Every structure is written in structure tokens, then in C-alpha cells.
Amino acid sequence: QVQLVESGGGLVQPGGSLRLSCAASGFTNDFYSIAWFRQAPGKEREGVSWLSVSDNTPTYVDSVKDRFTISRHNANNTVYLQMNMLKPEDTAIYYCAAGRFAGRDTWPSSYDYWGQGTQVTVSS
Amino acid sequence: NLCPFGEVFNATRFASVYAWNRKRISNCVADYSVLYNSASFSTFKCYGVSPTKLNDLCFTNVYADSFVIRGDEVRQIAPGQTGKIADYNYKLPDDFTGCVIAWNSNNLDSKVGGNYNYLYRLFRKSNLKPFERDISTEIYQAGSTPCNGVEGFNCYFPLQSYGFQPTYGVGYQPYRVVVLSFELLHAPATVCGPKKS
Amino acid sequence: QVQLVESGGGLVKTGGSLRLSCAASGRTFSTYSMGWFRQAPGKEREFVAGMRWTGSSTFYSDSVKGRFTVSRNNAKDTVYLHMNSLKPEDTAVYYCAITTIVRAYYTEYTEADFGSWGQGTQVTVSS
Ligand SMILES: *[C@@H]1O[C@H](CO)[C@@H](O)[C@H](O)[C@H]1NC(C)=O
Ligand SMILES: [Cl-]
């Protein structure tokens, strides 16, 4: 019943921009939270941004602070991650994840709902 | 009159999870949004309420429960979870109203050669009820055969040390946990968020 | 570190019995689980038997289970190894010690987990 529909990935040059989308359905209310995890080659899934939907409270890791922006459009129940000034270190498969709580967690195991990942590549 | 959260979050040593501690907080102003926005915390999840709503509510008492677990067990500190911690050590109710806060404590709670002080319960005859605390140390009878005071096949000691070392993987590193819960009695409501002050 | 005062042992015939004692003042044995270990010449010091700090659980190596028993007095300050049906293979220096390390499976204990060693006492079983 709960489904996370992901899209927006692709190839960009360093300094370039990309917009990922997470369309959430199957929730009876706004009392859930979204996370973006990225999984770079031979590494674990690592959280980069979070949105607590009820409170509309965003969180970012220090390395994406002033480059990444997370937001929600009420109408389409879609959360966006605007990624600007992209760098080679941002290359990874990006997942959105949902949990039935207000807040944030670094543990992938704490999120019960997952989008199909989208590939993000930043190279010359 | 700010709530003395520092006494819980900044305690030099934490409880073993099987013997988890509870601090009553009363007669003070709590800024749940300031806690939520702290980069010190890597886990901060509220159930039945959000930090914004808590900033606009008064309670009779707040309870801060605190203990150490390993990283891969942090996900068990949530309603409706299974595993050795949720089943045998620390259990939240299905209808939990409150917050779960956690942070990596490798720098504090691991030692070269192992910090054997922190224990968890590996075995129990039945699952804990919500907010139950079991500090018993009887042999666990895993099968139909009585143990008669002797450990062996299907007769195990119920507690186990983590033995935290700083070179453990993050799933095996110690995490400090604080669980906030809320009580409303027919009494003065002396713990308030800043908006309801 | 605590002082454990160990006694007993000596020479016994195959099939005979000996009692070893390990004493420590006050709350030591009700605080730290204890183990008995033995070491034969040129061999490693091996786990024999022990008792949880609770006094209500004992545990035994496969080599001695059903022949040796561990008990503790009412005062909780003296632990005994009751050695029965002794065999020449039981010949060794025996030690008591305590551990701060809680292992749910006693089968995982080794000498590295123990300290405050008692003075070793010779047990010799002759045919
Ligand atoms: C814990 O201590 C630090 C100072 O080292 C302080 O910045 C922080 O706010 C304290 N936490 C609480 C909840 O008081
Ligand atoms: Cl023990």
C-alpha cells in the first residue's frame, strides 16, 4: 500500500545541477518522514538529507549543506532534493526512504519503505 | 527555568540496556526543537507527536530513559520492532507518544581490549511489556529440561557483555540512547514547551 | 585485583576424591563470577569449572562434568571444587580466579578473561 516512486537521476558535469523526486502514496496522513540515502561504489548507504513532513523540518549532512535543498509539494505528495554545485564525490545511487515517525535517522535499517534507486554521476 | 536535559545527555556513564535508567523531569521549560536541531544526535524520531507540537504542550512529568546498545540495534528502539533489545531489554508500546534520540558513543564507551561494563539480555521466557525493566540473573531454561542450577545444553546465563573496542565496525560500536515519554496527571502541569509558557 | 587464598590438593589414588578451596574476604565472590583452571606441564591453562557471582549457577568443562562439583558456603566467601572419580589425566596445577566479563555461553570463557589468580596447587592422581 505505501509506495515510494523515485525519478530524476542522470549524468552532469562538475558545478552542474540535478533534481530528484520521491512521490509517496499509501500514507493515511502527513505523520511520516523522508530520508535521502546515497550508495557510492563499494560503500554502505549514507544519509545526506531528511524531511520531517508534519513539521516541515529539513536536515542536511555538513558536506551538502549549502549545495543541497530538500522540499515537499503538498499537491502531488512529492519530496524533491535540489542538488546544485555537484562534485565528483556526489556520484552514487540515490534512494528515498520513508518511516512512520516525525524526524530523522542515519540507520537505513530504521526506514521500512524504499524507492528504487536512481543513478547520479558527476564527471567530465 | 530550563529543563536539566544535560544531566541525562551528558552523563559520564550510561546504564546497560537491560538495567536502563529513568530520569523524571518536572517544573521547567523544555525546547524540543533545540534538541531536534542538534547535530550531536544522529537519530531523532518522535511518535504520536512532533517536536513542534511538544513546543506548544505542557505535561505533569517527562521521563528520560537512557542506556547503551550497539549501532545495529538502534532501529529496535521504536514501536512494533523485534530483536533481542525490543523483546528482552527495552520495549516501547504500540501507541508510543514520545521521542527516541541516539548518538555514536565510540569515543566514550569503547576501550582498547574491550569495555565489558555494558550488558544486554540475550534470553527471556517471554517478551517484555512496555517500559518493563528486568534485572534478574537466573539461568535461562531454553528447553523442556530443568537446568537445576547448572549451565549447559539449553541452559544459558541470560546476560552478555558487548565488550566495545574502538576498532569495531559501526554496527558493533556503542550508541547512547535517550527515550522521552510524557505523563499527564490531575496535578499542576509544570513541564512546558516555550510556546505554552 | 583482589587476594584469593587457595588451598587443598595433593596426591590421591585413581578413583579418589580431593577438595580445593578458594577464599576471598567480603563481597568478592558475590560480585565477580569465579573459575577453576588447570595446567599440566608444557600444556595450556584450561577451564575446569566455575560459578556465577549469583551463587545459583555452576558450569563444567566436558572433561570433568558429572565428576567435579563447585559449591560456595552460606557466607559467600569460600568456593570449593569437589573433585570425585579422579583419573591420572586430572594431574595438573589447579588455579581459582575471577572475571568481570559476562559471557552468556560459559563455553566461551578462556584464561584471558580471568584475573586475581590464586596460588596454583598441585593435584597428582597416581594409578
Ligand atoms: C551537553 O554538553 C554540551 C557542552 O559540552 C552542550 O553544548 C549541550 O547543550 C549539552 N546538552 C544538553 C542537553 O544540555
Ligand atoms: Cl559473569
Side-chain angles (χ1 to χ4, degrees):
Chain A
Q1 283 152 325
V2 174
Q3 206 192 322
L4 294 187
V5 170
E6 222 183 302
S7 53
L11 174 71
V12 77
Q13 301 177 86
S17 127
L18 207 45
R19 192 194 205 193
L20 311 182
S21 89
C22 188
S25 66
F27 292 115
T28 331
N29 56 44
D30 294 322
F31 198 83
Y32 66 92
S33 291
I34 297 297
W36 291 93
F37 287 83
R38 75 185 175 186
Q39 191 191 251
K43 291 183 185 172
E44 301 288 356
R45 300 188 182 185
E46 296 169 17
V48 292
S49 316
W50 298 263
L51 184 66
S52 185
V53 169
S54 49
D55 276 5
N56 204 35
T57 311
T59 309
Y60 307 97
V61 299
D62 280 341
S63 75
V64 308
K65 185 187 160 149
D66 295 307
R67 310 187 295 107
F68 282 23
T69 297
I70 196 168
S71 64
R72 183 162 163 283
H73 226 65
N74 213 30
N76 61 3
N77 229 296
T78 304
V79 172
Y80 302 91
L81 190 67
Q82 186 58 226
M83 306 187 294
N84 298 342
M85 299 173 52
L86 275 169
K87 296 189 297 179
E89 74 184 54
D90 299 315
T91 293
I93 304 158
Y94 284 66
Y95 298 86
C96 72
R100 294 179 188 282
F101 53 79
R104 58 188 175 82
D105 203 340
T106 55
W107 292 89
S109 56
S110 289
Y111 291 85
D112 290 340
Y113 310 107
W114 289 88
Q116 291 188 345
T118 187
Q119 178 65 57
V120 170
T121 314
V122 187
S123 66
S124 44
Chain B
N1 187 4
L2 296 175
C3 294
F5 285 124
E7 291 181 351
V8 180
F9 287 103
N10 286 334
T12 69
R13 209 181 333 105
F14 270 44
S16 290
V17 63
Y18 82 96
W20 54 269
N21 286 332
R22 174 161 286 188
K23 176 96 178 313
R24 184 180 68 95
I25 292 165
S26 60
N27 299 293
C28 55
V29 179
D31 199 333
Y32 304 95
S33 296
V34 164
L35 292 177
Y36 180 78
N37 283 304
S38 178
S40 304
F41 308 131
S42 50
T43 299
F44 207 125
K45 300 180 296 203
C46 305
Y47 300 87
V49 68
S50 68
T52 297
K53 186 161 200 193
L54 285 172
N55 269 21
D56 200 27
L57 288 177
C58 291
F59 293 97
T60 310
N61 297 300
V62 173
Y63 300 101
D65 301 337
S66 67
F67 50 84
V68 162
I69 56 178
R70 68 170 56 111
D72 70 17
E73 291 169 333
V74 166
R75 68 101 184 152
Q76 293 186 45
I77 316 304
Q81 293 304 301
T82 67
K84 298 306 201 287
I85 304 306
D87 296 344
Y88 305 150
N89 290 264
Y90 188 86
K91 174 67 171 182
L92 291 173
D94 289 350
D95 66 352
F96 181 48
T97 303
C99 305
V100 177
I101 309 162
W103 64 101
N104 183 294
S105 61
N106 202 36
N107 62 325
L108 299 178
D109 289 321
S110 77
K111 185 181 179 161
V112 169
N115 179 2
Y116 290 97
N117 283 332
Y118 291 107
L119 312 183
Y120 73 111
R121 186 174 303 280
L122 180 63
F123 304 106
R124 199 177 189 268
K125 166 159 176 164
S126 70
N127 294 342
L128 287 181
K129 304 307 169 79
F131 299 120
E132 187 176 5
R133 182 178 179 269
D134 181 355
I135 50 78
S136 68
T137 54
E138 284 306 286
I139 295 168
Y140 174 73
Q141 189 189 311
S144 66
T145 305
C147 303
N148 294 320
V150 179
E151 293 174 33
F153 186 64
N154 270 348
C155 288
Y156 313 123
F157 195 74
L159 302 181
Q160 174 65 48
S161 54
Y162 288 103
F164 295 118
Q165 297 182 40
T167 51
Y168 284 182
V170 66
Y172 287 92
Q173 287 173 24
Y175 277 68
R176 285 173 179 208
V177 181
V178 178
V179 180
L180 303 181
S181 60
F182 301 89
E183 182 173 68
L184 211 50
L185 305 174
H186 189 283
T190 69
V191 189
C192 297
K195 283 267 164 194
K196 190 63 77 194
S197 289
Chain C
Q1 193 162 142
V2 187
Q3 187 174 347
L4 305 186
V5 179
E6 187 177 329
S7 70
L11 178 57
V12 59
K13 286 209 174 70
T14 303
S17 292
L18 281 171
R19 190 193 76 178
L20 312 182
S21 297
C22 190
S25 55
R27 287 170 167 84
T28 294
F29 291 129
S30 60
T31 303
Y32 307 105
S33 297
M34 76 78 61
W36 293 100
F37 286 79
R38 71 190 177 180
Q39 184 164 32
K43 309 211 160 191
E44 296 205 313
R45 186 178 305 197
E46 62 183 31
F47 180 78
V48 172
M51 182 181 266
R52 297 294 177 177
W53 76 89
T54 64
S56 58
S57 171
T58 58
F59 42 88
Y60 303 88
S61 78
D62 289 356
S63 58
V64 307
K65 199 176 191 185
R67 301 189 298 117
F68 297 7
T69 309
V70 176
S71 74
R72 184 178 79 177
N73 67 349
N74 289 345
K76 308 180 184 192
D77 61 17
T78 312
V79 174
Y80 301 109
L81 184 66
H82 305 280
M83 297 163 89
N84 309 294
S85 302
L86 277 166
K87 311 175 168 168
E89 290 81 10
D90 298 313
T91 297
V93 177
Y94 286 70
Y95 300 87
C96 60
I98 51 168
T99 186
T100 72
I101 303 176
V102 183
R103 300 192 187 289
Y105 297 98
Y106 80 85
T107 58
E108 297 197 309
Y109 279 117
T110 74
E111 70 85 22
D113 296 332
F114 287 75
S116 294
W117 295 93
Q119 179 179 11
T121 193
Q122 184 69 53
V123 169
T124 304
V125 187
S126 180
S127 323

